[PDB]
């Protein structure tokens, strides 16, 4: 179909995005996206939010650390590529990740309030 996406979500590359104006905790963001039947942004590569590359806003994305896998994972369970965020070595494992469509990721206290981006796949 590819032309789903509520009213006022943005559709791009057969995905739907919701860019928040409201600032919420990482978990609150996680649940709001879940309430819209979507996930907190899983980034497959930086070109994915090309349309929004001028932004100088950080958004909570769907990446959190797994003690079990000794690695950072998306909410779906798939692994982070090493080349996606090169500083990932230095991310504090108790923190959540915020992301600027620039290309810059920052690890931050999950209880900080930030804007968030939800994403729906379509296949």
């Amino acid at each position: 179909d590819c032309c789903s996406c509520q009213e006022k979500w943005v559709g791009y590359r057969c995905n739907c995005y919701f860019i928040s104006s409201e600032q919420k905790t990482w978990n609150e963001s996680r649940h709001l996206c879940a309430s819209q039947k979507s996930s907190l942004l899983q980034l497959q590569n930086t070109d994915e939010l090309d349309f929004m590359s001028s932004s100088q806003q950080f958004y909570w994305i769907g990446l959190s650390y797994s003690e079990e896998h000794t690695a950072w994972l998306w909410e779906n369970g798939s692994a982070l590529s090493q080349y996606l965020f090169p500083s990932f070595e230095t991310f504090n494992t108790k923190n959540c990740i915020a992301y600027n469509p620039n290309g810059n990721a920052l690890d931050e206290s999950c209880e900080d309030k930030n804007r968030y981006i939800c994403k729906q796949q379509l296949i």
Partner: protein, 116 residues
């Protein structure tokens, strides 16, 4: 590499309209002709709310609104009076972070395109 059929391969849908967030700076007329070449129109603004949305996605853009001189009223490219207020020799309009600004038509500025 699949996409919503209603819009082209590298554009975005939002509210029953396609958008091209351009990323190349151009003159006002150069932007207008640039969009028409791409089979659409320079950025038009419908609501104040569209404006706020567009301000998340890109800080500056020409919009299809202009004057012949310092005072005839602001006119759209649909041939209508532009009913939103816009802030020396500035005869073309630009949207810059949720505000409508007057700018010198020969300035190179980012432009977006939008579909009916």
């Amino acid at each position: 590499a699949r996409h919503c059929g209603h819009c082209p391969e590298e554009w975005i849908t939002y509210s029953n309209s396609c958008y091209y967030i351009g990323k190349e700076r151009r003159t006002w007329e150069e932007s207008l002709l640039a969009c028409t070449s791409k089979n659409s129109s320079l950025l038009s603004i419908d609501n104040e709310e569209e404006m706020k949305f567009l301000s998340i996605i890109s800080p500056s853009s020409w919009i299809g609104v202009f004057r012949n001189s310092s005072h005839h009223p602001w006119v759209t490219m649909n041939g209508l009076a532009f009913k939103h207020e816009i802030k020396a020799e500035l005869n073309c309009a630009v949207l810059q972070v949720n505000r409508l600004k007057s700018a010198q038509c020969g300035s190179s500025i980012i432009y977006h395109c939008k579909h009916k």
